[PDB]
Structure 1
Amino acid sequence: HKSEVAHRFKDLGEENFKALVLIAFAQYLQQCPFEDHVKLVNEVTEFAKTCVADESAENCDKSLHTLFGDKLCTVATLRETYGEMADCCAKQEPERNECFLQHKDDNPNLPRLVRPEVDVMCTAFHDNEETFLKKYLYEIARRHPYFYAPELLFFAKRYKAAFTECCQAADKAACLLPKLDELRDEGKASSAKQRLKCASLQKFGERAFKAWAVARLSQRFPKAEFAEVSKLVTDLTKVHTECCHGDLLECADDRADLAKYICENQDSISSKLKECCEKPLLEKSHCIAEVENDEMPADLPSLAADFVESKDVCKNYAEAKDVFLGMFLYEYARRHPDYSVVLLLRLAKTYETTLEKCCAAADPHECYAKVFDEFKPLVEEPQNLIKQNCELFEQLGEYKFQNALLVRYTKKVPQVSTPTLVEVSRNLGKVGSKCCKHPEAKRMPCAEDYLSVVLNQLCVLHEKTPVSDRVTKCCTESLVNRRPCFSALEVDETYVPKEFNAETFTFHADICTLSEKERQIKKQTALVELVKHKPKATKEQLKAVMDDFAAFVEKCCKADDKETCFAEEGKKLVAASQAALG
């Protein structure tokens, strides 16, 4: 078109246009005050409106990158506030914008955003609803410069709905609070996954990414032809590559194009794209990415026919190794949407290895004939882990379950920091409840989606402050042996217990007046500390001490005299316990 600006305005709409402009500027000029950005957004918005009325109006023809960069260099304190970045303005558009991307701070040092009081929030909302949401939109954006703008906007709207509903409730807090905790966790998971996909692409390369995408896509579209999956896996890989680099526009168009291609060739891909393809430009991509698995054709022949028994398997394999393997993946994937993606790549890798040994032997059709038999143990392992952990989670309840893990992992890596072991075991328990609630069918895939982010959030910490060679062994290992490696860890027999510390086991009656969250985090921290002091304790010796401490609380926080009870009755517990646990 003649006007790129007028064009984006026209289909985005004024409301979405304005919110995206704000997020965009906030992600670059992360140091300017909110009132400053509002000024820009309005400036840009009024311009856009000019072009929509006459695509010929001066400058209406400039490119978005050009118009954007031009406005960015308009900032007067640019050099004084950002310094080096101001030098970008000396370059010409190809490099200028590339320069801006470079000087983007992924982890700025801004103060943690504290959550105000429901009533203060609801009142700010009611008075000035817009500036309330835009002010917070701007605060999240400057802190997460690499969060895909359109998706940040999708969360924004979900927030506006919670305040809309809850601030009318008789019991606002009971309404709002649990919704905000939910949204918080979601956006955090989304942020991590997005940062994870770009990391792997860099570390493991295109091949591994391609295989992950193939198994992934073949699961959602079991009816498409390998040729179609091939095409998509190809465009997709370019999209993530683009998107990871950073340019919002390049990444936005790449996704739009691919979303339209999928919708046009819809009948050629899946039957569950009905909705997503009827949706607005801004939501088409996001919808599709979240789409449910299409029913896999019911008429699907065997795999042993084309991969184990037929004779020219080596002939077809040597001719094009990757397409053959991609074919195995596609076939096995679309047949098993109840498998995690890493389980599939774990099977594909096993097969590849086997073909490499046999296609170079007297009679291969008999060297690789017992491969499928080697898949059995690979599949049963993650499966036996799910039942076992969901069975347990059922006999205990989230909290009591989180406690079981605590004892488990503290024993494995006692070297790890207590506040870390607690945070980790808490997130694991959450995964236990978020997934064990599904039928066998969707369990494994659920666990992988969640476990993936936790294991990495956990590995990144260790990165900054190493502690155990072992946790480093698994953290550096292949993204396919990441989880299996952690499950393989064994009780540390090397570790040397910590010297007693009464202060660590001294409780004053403030716990009785603390929130559930706080009481638990407090009892849980003593638990980690208790295991670090007496590592060889039994599940019995422990369950006992935990019973005595259990009652204790009730006896001192339901008694006329608190701190005395907590200091006179307490001395009794530690004295007895210290004896029981030898």
Structure 2
Amino acid sequence: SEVAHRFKDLGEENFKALVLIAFAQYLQQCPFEDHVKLVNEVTEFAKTCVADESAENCDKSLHTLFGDKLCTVATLRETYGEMADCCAKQEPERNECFLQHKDDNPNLPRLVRPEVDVMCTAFHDNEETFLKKYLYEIARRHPYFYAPELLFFAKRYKAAFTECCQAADKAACLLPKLDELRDEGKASSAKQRLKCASLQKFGERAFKAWAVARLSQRFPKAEFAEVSKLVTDLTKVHTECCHGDLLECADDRADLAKYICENQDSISSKLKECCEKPLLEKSHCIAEVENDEMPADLPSLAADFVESKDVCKNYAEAKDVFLGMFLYEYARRHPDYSVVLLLRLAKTYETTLEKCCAAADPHECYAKVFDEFKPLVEEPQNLIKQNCELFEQLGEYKFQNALLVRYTKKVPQVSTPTLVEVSRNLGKVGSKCCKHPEAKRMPCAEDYLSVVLNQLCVLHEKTPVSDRVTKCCTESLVNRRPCFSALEVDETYVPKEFNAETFTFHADICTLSEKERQIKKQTALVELVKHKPKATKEQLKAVMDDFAAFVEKCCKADDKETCFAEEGKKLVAASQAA
């Protein structure tokens, strides 16, 4: 019995919370109330199997039980449309159907907080129901959210309200925390979307390589066999979470934090204080722990991998394990390299072996590989350098605006809200990474951009419109950033039809937050580029500046919405005459 096994390895609180997430990530259109009853019904049954592992259906698979429980409310095609299809299937076909129906952008209501005095009251009234809804609303909007990590997020939300609802100035305590958890949450969701994308689109091998490179960078004093062991365990964890095996994922992940903290002396010195924290807090700290000092007593790759005469032997002997050792050794010595770069080098190395180890004289043939590594390394370095400079002169907002015009020109068929959001999240690389020195920039930036671009890939995957996006998003996982970077302004693209319904603003814009008002003006910028690309450049900054003054003025115009109309028509007229 697994339902019993999982119930007692996790405890009732996390068991009930993980079934709720699992249900909310599969049926994202179901109301909270419906999900709760289903979870509680399962939770009852789970306790039946704990008391007697030999009872009724206690020996069924987790997915059969949860799937049967889910399809009690799902088979209603009236409300959920083409998801009653999945409930007609049996396991494991049902679960695969559920996985392929996860929606990365459902038509769900915007989530706007009520007042602080309203929020704090509700938290105190029913605490558990309050937090269940948190899990509910994030999981239905983020169907790939790292589930065990979401439990940690609910814990921190629980703390914030418990603290700030009994503060002198409740709002001043609460809002910074709620904002910090919101942003930190999205970051977590995005990273995990990339992890799941690798597993499902590119396979186990692709993820394992990523895991080797990252863990080796982080545990460079750890022996190869240790990193490899950790890799296997980390890979099983995310394979389960991306495959909807949330309970097994959470259980195996708790086990992994356990192994690490026990064998701390053979992994990393930066793990003390992490292994002293409680369950969720410990697992969270380890995953994003600081990189360890690399051993100052360390030889050169060139000897073992390109100067040895036994490379071609050691390679063909164990192809993946040999390439693993190379990546490990190369990554361990380079926390200043992005994970993707390190993987590009491993492939470059792999391809030059495939060629030379079959050549007549293998040794002379691959005696130049590190010369291939050179432009691979310098290209991102310059990109990070060039973009960081641009960031300093523009600032976050104007920096996004540039990338927004840059990416609208690369891939103009892509929907506007997707262009606005992705360009923004891209532009946030400037604040996030440009503070660091060159020794910490490439990993911070390029791996971040890879995360953001994966969102582009999956928000576009749903309803494809651009060949170039589809292309970059399929041809590799590792070359995505330079593929998108290499894109030039689409010259085959035919300028969109002009419109009046997409440029004239309303007085409600004065009631929105600074973030929303930015998105409004940025949305209109995307459209404008989609309409008039060609040589358009600083004329845009001229039209963009005319927005701000127009909005600033007309919001303080004591208008009857006419200020937004009279210059609303005046803006367009001056724009046309170019």
Residues in 1 aligned to 2:104 and 2:563: alpha-carbon distance in whole angstroms:
50
How far apart in 2 are the matches of 1:265 and 1:186? Answer: 29
Q: Deviations over 1:532-580 (max 9, x none)?
A: 3332345333333444454444555555667665555565554444334
CA distance change for structure 1 residues 493 and 44 in 2, over 3 Å: closer, same or farther? closer
Separation of aligned partners in 2, 1:162 and 1:57: 42
Deviation of 1:382 after TM superposition, in Å, equals 0.9
1:277, CA displacement in angstroms?
2.9
Runs of 5+ in structure 1 lacking a partner?
none
Instruction: State the alpha-carbon separation in 1 of the partners of residues 105 and 577 from structure 2.
Output: 49
Q: Is the 8 A contact 1:531 1:537 kept in 2?
A: no
- Between the aligned partners of 1:166 and 1:353, the Cα distance in structure 2 is 57
Alpha-carbon distance in 1 for matches of 2:78, 2:547: 59
Alpha-carbon offset, residue 311 of structure 1 = 3.0
**CA separation of 1:220/1:534 partners in 2, compared to 1, >3 Å: closer, same or farther?**
same
Find the residue that maps to 1:85 and give its secondary structure.
coil
Report the CA distance shift for 1:373/1:278 in structure 2 as closer, same or farther (over 3 A): same
Q: How has the CA–CA distance of structure 1 residues 352 and 547 changed in structure 2, closer, same or farther, with 3 Å as cutoff?
A: same
Residues 147 and 241, structure 2, Cα contact 8 Å, conserved in 1: no
Q: Evaluate the alpha carbon distance shift between residue 504 and residue 205 of structure 1 in structure 2; reply closer, same or farther with a 3 A threshold.
A: closer
Using the TM superposition, give the Cα deviation of residue 377 of structure 1 relative to its aligned residue in structure 2, in angstroms: 0.9
Instruction: Report the CA distance shift for 1:31/1:301 in structure 2 as closer, same or farther (over 3 A).
Output: closer
Provide closer, same or farther for how the CA distance between residues 114 and 349 of structure 1 changes in structure 2, counting only shifts above 3 A.
same
- More deviation, 504-513/182-191: 504-513
CA contact (8 A) 1:28 1:104 kept: yes
Contact 1:101 1:247 in 2 (8 A): no
What's the offset of the Cα at 1:61? 12
Q: Aligned partners of 2:28, 2:527: CA distance in 1, in Å?
A: 41
TM-score (norm 2): 0.82
Report the CA distance between 1:221 and its aligned residue: 0.9
Contact 1:239 1:255 survives alignment (8 Å): yes
- How many angstroms does 1:332 deviate by? 0.5
CA shift digits 1:308-339 (9 cap, x unpaired): 33333333333333222222111100000121
Aligned partner (choices 320, 323, 341) of residue 322 of structure 1: 320
Q: Structure 1 pair 176/261, CA: closer, same or farther in 2 (3 Å)?
A: closer
546-555 vs 385-394, which moves further: 546-555
Instruction: Please tell me whether the aligned partners of residues 12 and 282 of structure 1 are also in contact (alpha carbons under 8 angstroms).
Output: no
Residues 315, 191 of structure 1: alpha-carbon distance in 2 compared, 3 angstrom cutoff: same
Could you tell me how far apart the structure 2 residues matched to 1:365 and 1:539 are?
52
**Inter-partner Cα distance in structure 2 for 1:578 and 1:90:** 55
CA 1:368–1:428: 2 relative to 1, 3 Å = same
Alpha-carbon distance change, 111 to 318 in structure 1, aligned in 2, over 3 angstroms? same
Contact 1:338 1:444 in 2 (8 A): yes
Render the CA deviation track for 1:355-385: whole Å, top value 9, x for unaligned.
2333344544332222212211111111111
Higher mean C-alpha deviation, range 60-69 or range 24-33 = 60-69
Distance 2:177 2:384 in 1: 28
Residue from 438, 459, 467 that aligns with 2:436: 438
Deviation at 1:407, TM superposition (A): 1.8
Label 1:46 to 1:382 Cα distance change in 2 as closer, same or farther (>3 A).
same
More divergent stretch after superposition (163-172 vs 427-436): 163-172
Q: Percent sequence identity over matched residues?
A: 100
Pair 170,389 (structure 1): closer, same or farther in 2 beyond 3 Å: farther
Greater Cα shift, 324-333 or 88-97: 88-97
Greater CA drift, 31-40 or 70-79: 70-79
Superposition deviation, residue 103 in structure 1 = 11
- Contact conserved, 2:270 with 2:289, CA < 8 A, in 1? yes
CA deviation string 1:242-261 (max 9, x = no partner): 44433344334433443333
Cα distance, 1:97 vs structure 2:
10
Worse-matched range after superposition: 334-343 or 396-405: 396-405
Residue 184 of structure 1 and its aligned partner are, at CA, apart by 2.9
Kindly tell me: are residues 112 and 213 of structure 1, through their superposed partners in 2, closer, same or farther at Cα, counting changes over 3 Å? same
Q: Is the 8 A contact 1:22 1:41 kept in 2?
A: yes
- Does the 8 Å CA contact 2:76/2:84 hold for their aligned counterparts? yes
Q: Give the SS at the match of 1:551.
A: helix
Aligned counterparts of 2:317 and 2:425: Cα–Cα separation in 1: 47
Tell which deviates more after alignment, 568-577 or 428-437.
Answer: 568-577
For residues 392-415 of structure 1, the C-alpha deviation after alignment (integer angstroms, 9 at most, x for no partner) is 211122112111112212222233
Question: What per-residue deviation string (whole Å, max 9, x for no partner) do you get for residues 489-517 of structure 1?
Answer: 10122233345545554456554554323
Residues in 2 aligned to 1:143 and 1:535: alpha-carbon distance in whole angstroms: 34
Task: Give the conservation status (yes or no) of the 8 Å contact 1:200–1:209.
Answer: yes
**Kept in 2: contact 1:435–1:443 (CA 8 A):** yes
The answer to which of 366-375 and 154-163 deviates more is 366-375
1:222 Cα shift? Answer: 0.4
Q: Do the aligned partners of residues 83 and 471 (structure 1) sit closer, same or farther apart at CA in structure 2, a change above 3 Å counting? A: closer
Higher relative contact order (CA 8 A, sep 6+): 2
SS of residue in 2 equivalent to 1:438: coil
From the superposition, tell whether residues 267 and 68 of structure 1 become closer, same or farther in structure 2 (CA, over 3 Å): same
Matched-pair contact (CA < 8 Å) for 1:5–1:60: yes
* Structure 1 residues 405 and 77: alpha-carbon distance in aligned structure 2, compared to 1, 3 A threshold: closer
Q: Say if 1:369 and 1:17 are closer, same or farther in 2 by CA, change over 3 A.
A: closer
Distance 2:233 2:371 in 1: 35
Q: 1:242 to 1:165 in 2, by over 3 A?
A: closer
Is the CA contact (8 Å cut-off) linking 2:339 and 2:443 kept in structure 1?
yes
Deviation, 1:122, is 2.1
For 1:496 and 1:26, the matched residues in 2 are separated by 41
Return closer, same or farther for 1:48/1:525 CA change in 2, 3 Å cut-off. Answer: closer
Within-5 A mapping of 1:257-406: 257-406=255-404
What is the CA-CA distance between 1:174 and the residue it aligns to? 5.2
Gaps of 5+ in 2: none
Structure 1 Cα separation of the partners of residues 116 and 326 of structure 2:
54
Structure 1 window deviating more from structure 2 (483-492 vs 453-462): it is 453-462
My pick for the range that moved more, 38-47 or 369-378, is 38-47
Alpha-carbon separation, structure 2, partners of 1:132 and 1:547: 44
Q: Quote the Cα distance in structure 2 between the aligned partners of 1:375 and 1:57.
A: 61
The whole-number CA distance in structure 2 between the counterparts of 1:115 and 1:185 is 15
C-alpha change, 1:279 and 1:87, in structure 2 (3 Å) is: same
Q: 1:24/1:245 Cα in 2 relative to 1: closer, same or farther (>3 Å)?
A: closer
Instruction: Provide the alpha-carbon RMSD of the alignment.
Output: 4.6
Q: Within 2, Cα distance between the matches of 1:257 and 1:171?
A: 41
- The DSSP-based 3-state class of the residue aligned with 2:251 is helix
> For residues 520 and 272 of structure 2, what CA distance do their matches in structure 1 show?
50
> Structure 1 75/518 Cα, relative in aligned 2: closer, same or farther at 3 Å?
closer
Give the direction of change, closer, same or farther, for the CA distance of 1:508–1:44 in structure 2 (3 Å limit): closer
CA distance in 1, matches of 2:462, 2:110: 20
Distance of aligned partners of 1:424 and 1:174 in 2 relative to their CA distance in 1, 3 Å threshold: farther
Deviation string, structure 1 residues 78-111 (Cα, Å, up to 9, x no partner): 9999999999999999999999999999998876
Q: Is the contact between residue 556 and residue 562 of structure 1 (CA under 8 Å) also seen in structure 2?
A: no
Worse-matched range after superposition: 153-162 or 501-510: 501-510
Change over 3 Å in CA distance of 1:470–1:563 after alignment to 2: same
Contact 1:259–1:288 under 8 Å retained in 2? yes
Aligned residues: 578
Residues 1:373 and 1:564: Cα distance change in structure 2 (over 3 Å): same
CA distance in 1, matches of 2:568, 2:66: 66
How far did residue 219 of structure 1 move?
0.9
In 2: Cα distance, 1:56 partner to 1:535 partner: 69
For residues 386 and 104 of structure 1, what CA distance do their matches in structure 2 show? 34
Distance 1:282 1:44, change over 3 A: farther
Structure 1 range deviating more: 136-145 or 425-434 = 136-145
- Which range moved further: 125-134 or 348-357? 125-134
Contact 2:326 2:346 in 1 (8 A): yes
| Residue 462 in structure 1 maps to residue 484 in structure 2 | no
Equivalent position of 2:209 in the other structure: 211
- Deviation by residue 1:182-208 (Cα, 9 ceiling, x = unmatched): 423433343343343233223323332
1:119-157 C-alpha deviation (Å, 9 max, x unpaired) = 322221233333322344345456666655432221111
Aligned counterpart, 2:480: 482
102-111 or 237-246, larger mean C-alpha shift = 102-111
- Residues 1:29 and 1:336: Cα distance change in structure 2 (over 3 Å): closer
User: Using a 3 Å threshold, how does the CA distance of structure 1 residues 389 and 17 change in structure 2: closer, same or farther?
Assistant: same
| Residues 240 and 246 in structure 2, CA contact (< 8 A), matched pair in contact too | no
- Using structure 1 for the length normalisation, give the TM-score: 0.81
- Of the structure 1 ranges 471-480 and 282-291, higher mean CA displacement relative to structure 2 is found in 282-291
Partner of 1:152: 150
